[PDB]
């Protein structure tokens, strides 16, 4: 004599994608403050299988950053009157006529741009329109916690070493993902998550060369960058109200890099064989956002060769790579939009931890070149432990109880 019974709050979930909100410790004004201590619940005897390659969280964060950043250019001054023929000489001292506060008058002004910002007849006009950044806002990175709303949850693979795919024996769940750095770094990961046990190697397809190969450090690598020239910026008046602000090697230790690389080559291990030579080589070419370790440091854009790091051959048994500022950029390959970075008073020095690599390889000993391209891979170096699930709390089951009549 069995009967059904409704149970509410039963522990049942399914893989699913939805809208996630943000939390910001204690564009980051609308993010609710993080709980001073979050809660993490281990799921004993639970095995959940992950597929970091098919993550929706990554493609929501990426579309977020893109649409968040466009908001950072709305109340800022548009540069449209800065597409004029440039009379230039050698950094370059370019002179040009300019629109003034009133409609009638004109003004001759000289500024200082980089060889990459200009082309012989600026590079952007050929491609897209331009808007300068608001000097009031800043691009410093704050830890961002992605959280799942009610009725959903986020599972975390606890295990110290995880490929990003397959079964996770130690699983837990939290409301909010850890403080993830939204830093756009190229080639080398900056200020990221440092692996608990041994460096992990992850690629959408190991056997396929075309799929970029991500590396996660366990020992951080210090790196010093600097714009060692005391600049001064003069605010020429392209009124009314609006005003345009007219107007470098980077270093990492070698004693740690040799030590770091040797762990990397051993980390490859079986994937390419114990008995094989491992080659490091500079970038094969492509976009300037791939060829160099592009990253923003102190509000300026530093575009450095990694050619000094990447040439080595490894048999089975304080170096410095410089930089030139990139000036205007159309990050995320977005055309029709363009930001010019207004220069800053004073010398810039910033030092970040290196926490991993993005690498590409050629098909046939195998050779490795610096990776680049899409920024989605950068997020997947933090969201490998995460996936989103709905909660299905209704449960019906046979019992032996009956209600009244």
């Amino acid at each position: 004599n069995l009967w059904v019974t409704v149970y509410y709050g039963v522990p049942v979930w399914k893989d699913a994608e939805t809208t996630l909100f943000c939390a910001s410790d204690a564009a980051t004004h609308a993010c609710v403050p993080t709980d001073p201590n979050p809660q993490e619940i281990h799921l004993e005897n639970v095995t959940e299988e992950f597929n970091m390659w098919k993550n929706n969280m990554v493609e929501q964060m990426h579309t977020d950053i893109i649409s968040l950043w466009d908001q950072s250019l709305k109340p800022c001054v548009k540069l449209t009157p800065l597409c004029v023929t440039l009379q230039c000489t050698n950094l370059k001292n370019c002179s040009f006529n300019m629109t003034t506060e009133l409609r009638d008058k004109k003004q001759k002004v000289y500024s200082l741009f980089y060889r990459l910002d200009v082309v012989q007849i600026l590079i952007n006009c050929n491609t897209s329109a331009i808007t300068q950044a608001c000097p009031k806002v800043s691009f410093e990175p704050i830890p961002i916690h992605y959280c799942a709303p009610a009725g959903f949850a986020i599972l975390k693979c606890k295990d110290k070493k995880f490929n990003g795919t397959g079964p996770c024996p130690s699983v837990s769940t939290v409301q909010c993902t850890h403080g993830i750095k939204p830093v756009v770094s190229t080639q080398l990961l900056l200020n990221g998550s440092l692996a608990e046990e041994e460096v992990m190697i992850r690629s959408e397809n190991i056997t396929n060369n075309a799929k970029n190969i991500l590396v996660q450090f366990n020992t951080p690598v210090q790196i010093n960058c600097t714009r060692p020239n005391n600049n001064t910026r003069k605010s020429i008046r392209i009124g009314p109200g609006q005003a345009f602000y007219a107007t470098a090697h980077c270093n990492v230790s070698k004693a740690t890099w040799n030590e770091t690389l040797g762990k990397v080559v051993k980390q490859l291990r079986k994937h390419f064989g114990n008995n094989t030579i491992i080659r490091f080589a500079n970038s094969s070419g492509g976009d300037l956002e791939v060829t160099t370790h592009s990253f923003n440091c102190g509000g300026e854009f530093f575009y450095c060769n990694t050619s000094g790091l990447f040439n080595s051959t490894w048999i089975s048994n304080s170096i410095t790579l410089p930089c030139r500022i990139k000036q205007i950029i159309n990050m995320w390959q977005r055309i029709g939009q363009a930001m010019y970075a207004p220069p800053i008073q004073g010398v810039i020095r910033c030092v970040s931890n290196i926490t991993g690599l993005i690498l590409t390889r050629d098909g046939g000993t195998e050779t490795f070149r610096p990776g680049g391209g899409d920024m989605r891979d950068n997020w997947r170096s933090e969201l490998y432990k995460y996936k989103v699930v709905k909660i299905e709390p209704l449960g019906v089951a046979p019992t032996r109880c009956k209600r009244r009549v």
């Binding site: 009967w3 639970v46 409301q175 089951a397 019992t399």
Partner: protein, 124 residues
Amino acid sequence: LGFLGAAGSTMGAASMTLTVQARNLLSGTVWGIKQLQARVLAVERYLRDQQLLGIWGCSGKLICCTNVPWNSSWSNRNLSEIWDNMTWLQWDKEISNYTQIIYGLLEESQNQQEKNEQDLLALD
């Protein structure tokens, strides 16, 4: 043991901690609009589940007895097998074919015939 704590335990043991997943089932300018739709979605998914509990004779939270007989064709099994040797995730997959049969059976076989019964019955 916290939220979703008994996911890997047997159905019999997981039903002791129902109030932990149930209490955390509602969990207490652009860009900020992304967080608004989420909490709007939060209530309509919660009310969609509780509308069923409403048209079912439950309302009272977490556990509720009914008068719908458990049909053999749907997951005919030893009670000890179901609750002492099975997890809810496993069970939700086995009854999966017969769930919405039960959902529909619940609303009509039990409350629709039960309160009109009481309506006829409470006449004297």
